[PDB]
Write a protein that binds this ligand. Structure first.
Ligand SMILES: CCC1=C(C)/C(=C/C2=NC(=C\c3[nH]c(/C=C4\NC(=O)[C@H](C)[C@H]4CC)c(C)c3CCC(=O)O)/C(CCC(=O)O)=C2C)NC1=O
Ligand SMILES: CCC1=C(C)/C(=C/C2=NC(=C\c3[nH]c(/C=C4\NC(=O)[C@H](C)[C@H]4CC)c(C)c3CCC(=O)O)/C(CCC(=O)O)=C2C)NC1=O
Ligand SMILES: CCC1=C(C)/C(=C/C2=NC(=C\c3[nH]c(/C=C4\NC(=O)[C@H](C)[C@H]4CC)c(C)c3CCC(=O)O)/C(CCC(=O)O)=C2C)NC1=O
Ligand SMILES: CCC1=C(C)/C(=C/C2=NC(=C\c3[nH]c(/C=C4\NC(=O)[C@H](C)[C@H]4CC)c(C)c3CCC(=O)O)/C(CCC(=O)O)=C2C)NC1=O
Ligand SMILES: CCC1=C(C)/C(=C/C2=NC(=C\c3[nH]c(/C=C4\NC(=O)[C@H](C)[C@H]4CC)c(C)c3CCC(=O)O)/C(CCC(=O)O)=C2C)NC1=O
Ligand SMILES: CCC1=C(C)/C(=C/C2=NC(=C\c3[nH]c(/C=C4\NC(=O)[C@H](C)[C@H]4CC)c(C)c3CCC(=O)O)/C(CCC(=O)O)=C2C)NC1=O
Ligand SMILES: CCC1=C(C)/C(=C/C2=NC(=C\c3[nH]c(/C=C4\NC(=O)[C@H](C)[C@H]4CC)c(C)c3CCC(=O)O)/C(CCC(=O)O)=C2C)NC1=O
Ligand SMILES: CCC1=C(C)/C(=C/C2=NC(=C\c3[nH]c(/C=C4\NC(=O)[C@H](C)[C@H]4CC)c(C)c3CCC(=O)O)/C(CCC(=O)O)=C2C)NC1=O
Ligand SMILES: CCC1=C(C)/C(=C/C2=NC(=C\c3[nH]c(/C=C4\NC(=O)[C@H](C)[C@H]4CC)c(C)c3CCC(=O)O)/C(CCC(=O)O)=C2C)NC1=O
Ligand SMILES: CCC1=C(C)/C(=C/C2=NC(=C\c3[nH]c(/C=C4\NC(=O)[C@H](C)[C@H]4CC)c(C)c3CCC(=O)O)/C(CCC(=O)O)=C2C)NC1=O
Lengths: 162, 172, 48, 60, 162, 172, 172, 162, 162, 172, 162
């Protein structure tokens, strides 16, 4: 799980040396940038339900054809799977915010992403549009540096999808 | 390898839920105390030769048998390996201190060190004694109020003592 | 090509074989570039 | 996680060395390999392609 | 050299990826710590001559035998080389403070320290004493985070010499 | 690898002198505008797929001869190589923009790139055109006022244009 | 590896005191018969193919179940492995003869040769008989007084038979 | 350990071949040189105590400041350690003489020497001067080829230290 | 070639170290055994005609089936090549004696031996018989250590053939 | 890499001839004086740190520009590389003095050395100066009559001087 | 054993994919020509005794000297072993025919052949002549593509011997 502290430790361990000035300042920057990321985590965890339902509806609007029968969107089971997937994405983005690192996303979504989307035929543009919705929402639910944190992690997830 | 934030995320994911406000405010408090942690880690790093030298001096004061012929620290080679091991354990303890969890210490320094020492004939008791003396010296160097602002960090002192004792307990 | 022997190191070995093997390893893998003492990996060769 | 693989070199490997030859020095049949999780699949499939038979794979 | 920005870019490059949030957070911590670091570099550059002279005097007090005839500190050329060397260490500590990393020290002093000291029979303990004096005096100067920044690099040098 | 700080340090060390006060004030400037630099780098990073897609669309609208049979971007192998090179060049541009020095681009990305491309048969003029198109696309995102506090970033725009121009000139 | 001189040095170092006059006298005697030892080693070396061929012929005449199809040495590859194993065992035996210590044979080979032969399916008594036949073949060449000055080397014959029977019993 | 015979056997085994003319000639050289080497070992074992006492006193004359209170050589325990170390060196020199190889000195002194002396702040020049004194009385004690053998092993030790 | 001096120097170089006692004693043994070796080389060089013609005749006696028409030995050219080959072997044996190492034999005869023989269908037993005859005649031409040296190198060649 | 014996052998092989009597006599002469050669090699090997120390001191006393900031031996790294180079050249000169042929130097020590020095920007003149200083310092230890039998070793002194000169000429 | 189907599987496994049309084509090519190879195998297995005895007699005719007292041919057990060896070669030829691959020959004769022949002083030319007789006989014992199969395998063995 790659974070600021994890990279700090990995480098100094690979070199076989004690942690020194460089990575101590890196960890300091992480500790200082924790609090806006932490309270952005607060914000996204609080409003999870509305964000998931809105993102699902935005996906079903941008891709109306998925709704009609014979497609992936037909059915309550598929619908619940859509909500579950968007909730997974939101949960792991909050994990990345609290962790001050991309490690949670890399470990839990990005790793194995394309293979299983190809295997289960899950179009990545669906989740890209959902994440763009959540991007629009975090544009208004957050202000200041926390807005920037949420946007960076969300659009990192998007780039991983795109 | 693993962190305290990543520990909490692991618990959250095995539970299958978001992060609770209790764990999350705990993590915020850890983030604020991170500066005290940085001072603790720097205190360990800046004094590693001093801690190691003191620990080895008193270790070979207590146990002559290691440095007599037939001892396990006798030739220059085995003495050098000894001091290298002291260096390694202290380094990984500092890593565990900065991270906030003792995951890295076990997962890297201490996977198979006991059976290594058993096969080599190294007395694990004396290794654990050396780690204890290292803890004593490190605690001496952590308490230093000079060159740093005054406050309470007994949480750090307890956590560092636990890391040292966990390493020593894994040794023997 | 011919004069230098192939350096082989199995798990049981004595001190001189180990030291010569490390000399050959560093003289090959690191180019022929000088590797100062502050760069020598001690944990890696302890594992070896 | 780390996985220790105890591989026994057997007749399947001996035939391959009898055909291709020994470009590397001959070694005892039973030895243990230690791998990370990332490397476990490639190393184990490689040991299979070489004809080696694994005995025990222990986690650590 | 190996300064915070350089480990950032180096890790991104080796992993074949763009700079993510962790990398920029480490960079941001670097840019914060630049203020006391360059303040400390200014103070040390200003007071270099007094620090060098005092460190040389401390060396000669701790190891009086060095100045006896036939010893390494006998004569004016030897002691001028002493002063030059202490100025070197001070220069590279100020460089490391400016660059926010031990890259300048690692690259211009520590790389090759032991071999050179052994060939010319230079005792590292002399430089330990000189750097200890520089530490004690930069305690008097440099109040605040500047003190901690200076002592980190002084200790890196001292730990290298031992 | 060098940034502005290490470059100033190396220049000063060449004449064996401490860093002058003028140099220190210049570096303190660079540090103070560091946050604007970070936002520029993040803009380059986060919009990279869009930058490369727009650049590719424009380039292969102007230059059909690339995507025709017998062109150097014809099969998927060569077109994938085209897009890969564009993303790598943009990546190193962003590295250099964060660094404030262009040395990473010259050492890694552009070291013998013209000779490589001449050897492979690539029209280096087309690569330079792709880099210019990427610059044009990147300036749009660099100038994005949304999601960031308003301020002056003209110097950063000039610097990013400088690194893009360096890449384009070195390739062709 | 370890030599008789090295063995004595190791024993002296374990008790940490200088080699005694009796030890020095024994080692001086060893160096005095070193010339005879060199002749014995040269005798083993110069007729090694003859030793292998004689041992193999006698063994396979004794035990035809290895030759016949389905035996442990039936195809060409298994025959070649048989001969190579005999050859390497002889080479290690001559190493032990030259050094005067059985360490060079005991350390690398005999420890894992047991597991190897058990895994491959070789009859172990067959291999022990092969080594014994090698000893019997080699004694004749060791005795051959032609081209060497007439002398007594009962110690050398005893030690060589010791190494041969030790390897055979180890594999057994 | 590194003897002549062991180098023979390892070179022969590494190439998977038998012992031959070059290797038996090396062994013959060893067996011829055994007589001066065993003689020198005998003569040095007779006079171990006087040699060690003289070497310790030689160090104390050459580095008088060491005996000063607060230094390494102050105190009976430290001087007993000094005598023990010189005895160690002399014993391993005798072992190397007997083995006709520097394998004993290498394995038991030289391997790990620099790091150990660095950790305990043991100046190698002390042991170099003590070995110089031993070299001096080897000329008086030994004559012929035993003299040369003892001197070359002592020079191997001194080269390792220096 | 792989002579004593050259292998000494090569192994010293591959470990980046000077020539120590082991190597110098090996070289001393070589320089001492030079005398019997140069004497053997003189004896064989003076008697090369009788040795080679006798070896050819011995081969033709132990292999009667070679001289008749239809196979390898029939014809003046083939017998001339026989004598030339045995002259080669004897030349390289004397070279080995002079150099005190199998290096000449290895490099000039043994490397590529089996492939060349297989390609030209030359039976190694022929050269084994010739070398056995030369061994027998050197038993009479040489005495003492010269005989042992010559026989050692001849046996090395024979073992390489078989 | 040849010695004198292998060089004579190579010439004899090219002629297709056995070694002539006079060639064998020159070789017997070389081996008969081999003891003095071994003493000279021991003198070079045993005093090598002293030789390199003295050469280095004299070289940096003459040429202060090497150790001024911007000089080629300025930081510790470059000084350490310089001392290693002197170590290496002395090592190979001892190898050539033992073999008696200067083929080891051009085969190994000086193979691509001049190109190396040109590409690094090393002043080859100063390197040749360093080699001359080592030659001068080495002659002192080669003529040292202590601990060795008095005798005529002028051929050895001249040969060693020529090896040093061949180096310093190949670099320069 | 390197049967063509076996090599198909090995190559597909090495490249880590399923069986594309490329090696299906090769498997088909084997499956069609199995018929001539299998009938050649049956024809060879029927006439095995005559072929073995004729090969033995051809060996003794081409090399009359072998049977004479004092070497390999003499001794009834030696002719028995000769017959057994040509029997083995014929048997593995039949195996390689029925398997549509040189695998049986490769792993039952060629693997380890040279070292075995060298160690027992068996001339490969004996077996080359025996296989030449077998080839001459099977030239008339078979017709059509079965003859081509048999000749390819017999000559693969012949080239292996040489
Ligand atoms: C992954 C991280 C890591 C660790 C933790 C590590 C420790 C370590 N110490 C070792 C040996 C050793 N360790 C010691 C030290 C002990 N014996 C002394 O008596 C002291 C009481 C005590 C130290 C306080 C000694 C003397 C040896 C040498 C044993 C021998 O070779 O006989 C070894 C075996 C290889 C060797 O001989 O160097 C390891 C792996 N190495 C690593 O790469
Ligand atoms: C470059 C690496 C780095 C260092 C070295 C560092 C030290 C550091 N220590 C701080 C405060 C502190 N540091 C400590 C810890 C100390 N208090 C003592 O009693 C203990 C002995 C000791 C614990 C080991 C405490 C208690 C504070 C006060 C927290 C506060 O400012 O509110 C602060 C914030 C306030 C300030 O000093 O201006 C910093 C930046 N920060 C870094 O990023
Ligand atoms: C086959 C034996 C062998 C030789 C001979 C050898 C020479 C050698 N010298 C080197 C560098 C060097 N050599 C020198 C020495 C010169 N500069 C000083 O001014 C002196 C005047 C002078 C020495 C007397 C220096 C300073 C360097 C470092 C160049 C640099 O760091 O830029 C290097 C480059 C290695 C690296 O830096 O990674 C090599 C390969 N290497 C070998 O393997
Ligand atoms: C996780 C990685 C990370 C990021 C992304 C980051 C961004 C960051 N942007 C900032 C402000 C800023 N950002 C900008 C840049 C803008 N000015 C123009 O509008 C341009 C369109 C645009 C450039 C792309 C400016 C001008 C400021 C205000 C700073 C000042 O006025 O001095 C600040 C200072 C506090 C604030 O005003 O909110 C930070 C920390 N910090 C981080 O640790
Ligand atoms: C350290 C030195 C060393 C030794 C000693 C050693 C022995 C050794 N013998 C082996 C096989 C063998 N070894 C034998 C020999 C025995 N079987 C009987 O038939 C004979 C009577 C008898 C010979 C005296 C045979 C026949 C095989 C082949 C087994 C098979 O291929 O299945 C193998 C398996 C590797 C291979 O077949 O290519 C090893 C490793 N390896 C070493 O690295
Ligand atoms: C080139 C490699 C090399 C070899 C081969 C070698 C052998 C060698 N054998 C010798 C004599 C000898 N050789 C033997 C051994 C034989 N005596 C009995 O016949 C035994 C059957 C048989 C032992 C297998 C003996 C007993 C001596 C006489 C030693 C003595 O008692 O003085 C001598 C001394 C001759 C003298 O100075 O008078 C040497 C140097 N030395 C070498 O440097
Ligand atoms: C088998 C090879 C071997 C050697 C050679 C060896 C030397 C050695 N001497 C030591 C202590 C020491 N040795 C000395 C010797 C000094 N006393 C002064 O009078 C002299 C100037 C000088 C000696 C010439 C001193 C002062 C110490 C104490 C260092 C300390 O307390 O840290 C130590 C540290 C551990 C201990 O003994 O407690 C070592 C390893 N150890 C070995 O295993
Ligand atoms: C940029 C990094 C760098 C450093 C640090 C450095 C140190 C250094 N100092 C040296 C000389 C010296 N340096 C000293 C220092 C001593 N003088 C005594 O008064 C004191 C006790 C003591 C200092 C505290 C002495 C005595 C010498 C002369 C040594 C000799 O001539 O052998 C030398 C040998 C070459 C020379 O300059 O003449 C080096 C390499 N050189 C570098 O390029
Ligand atoms: C272990 C490695 C080893 C070495 C190093 C060794 C040296 C060695 N030096 C010797 C004497 C000698 N050594 C020298 C050389 C010296 N003469 C002085 O004037 C010069 C400064 C210097 C070189 C010219 C001379 C001239 C002799 C006597 C002449 C001779 O022995 O042929 C001898 C012959 C013994 C005698 O006849 O007294 C040997 C074997 N032997 C060995 O086994
Ligand atoms: C399955 C693979 C395989 C083959 C091919 C094989 C051939 C073979 N034949 C042998 C014996 C023999 N083979 C012959 C063959 C000669 N007899 C004369 O009539 C002819 C001129 C000539 C045959 C054309 C002779 C004379 C011997 C006895 C001498 C000996 O090799 O020990 C031997 C030595 C050990 C033994 O008796 O088995 C082998 C390995 N063995 C195998 O396991």
């Amino acid at each position: 799980s790659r974070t600021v502290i994890t990279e700090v430790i990995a480098t100094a361990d690979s070199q076989g040396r004690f942690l020194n000035s460089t990575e101590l300042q890196a960890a300091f920057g992480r500790f200082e940038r924790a609090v806006p990321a932490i309270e952005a985590a607060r914000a996204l965890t609080k409003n999870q339900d509305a964000l998931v339902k809105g993102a699902v509806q935005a996906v079903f609007k941008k891709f109306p054809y998925v709704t009609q029968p014979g497609e992936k969107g037909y059915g309550d089971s598929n619908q619940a799977k859509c909500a579950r997937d968007i909730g997974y994405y939101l949960r792991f983005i909050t994990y990345s915010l609290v962790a001050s690192g991309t490690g949670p996303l890399d470990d839990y979504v990005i790793a194995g992403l394309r293979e299983v989307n190809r295997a289960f035929n899950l179009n990545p543009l669906w989740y890209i549009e959902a994440l763009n919705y959540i991007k629009g929402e975090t544009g208004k639910l957050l202000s200041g540096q926390s807005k920037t944190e949420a946007l960076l992690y969300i659009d990192h997830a998007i780039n991983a999808l795109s | 390898m693993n962190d305290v934030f990543t520990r909490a995320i692991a618990q959250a994911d095995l539970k299958g839920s978001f992060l609770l406000e209790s764990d999350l405010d705990k993590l915020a408090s850890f983030a604020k105390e991170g500066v005290k942690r940085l001072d603790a880690v720097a205190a360990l790093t800046n004094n590693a030769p001093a801690i190691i030298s003191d620990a080895a001096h008193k270790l070979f004061a207590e146990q002559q048998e290691l440095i007599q012929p037939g001892g396990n620290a006798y030739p220059h080679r085995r003495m050098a390996a000894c001091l290298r091991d002291m260096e390694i354990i202290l380094r990984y303890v500092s890593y565990a201190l900065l991270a906030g969890d003792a995951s890295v210490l076990d997962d890297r320094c201490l996977n198979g060190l006991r059976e290594t020492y058993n096969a080599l004939g190294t007395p694990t008791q004396s290794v654990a004694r050396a780690v204890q003396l290292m803890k004593d010296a490190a605690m001496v160097h952590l308490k230093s109020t000079a060159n740093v602002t005054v406050g309470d960090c007994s949480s750090l002192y307890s956590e560092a003592a636990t890391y040292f004792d966990k390493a020593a307990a894994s040794i023997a | 090509a011919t004069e230098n022997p192939k350096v082989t190191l199995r798990a049981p070995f004595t001190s001189e074989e180990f030291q010569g093997a490390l000399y050959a390893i560093y003289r090959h893998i690191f180019g022929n570039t000088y590797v100062m003492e502050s760069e020598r990996p001690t944990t890696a060769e302890s594992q070896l | 996680r780390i996985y220790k693989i105890t591989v026994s070199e057997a007749g399947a490997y001996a035939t391959n060395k009898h055909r291709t030859g020994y470009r590397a020095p001959i070694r005892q049949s039973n030895y243990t390999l230690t791998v990370p999780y990332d490397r476990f699949l490639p190393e184990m499939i490689r040991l299979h392609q070489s004809g080696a038979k694994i005995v025990n794979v222990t986690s650590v």
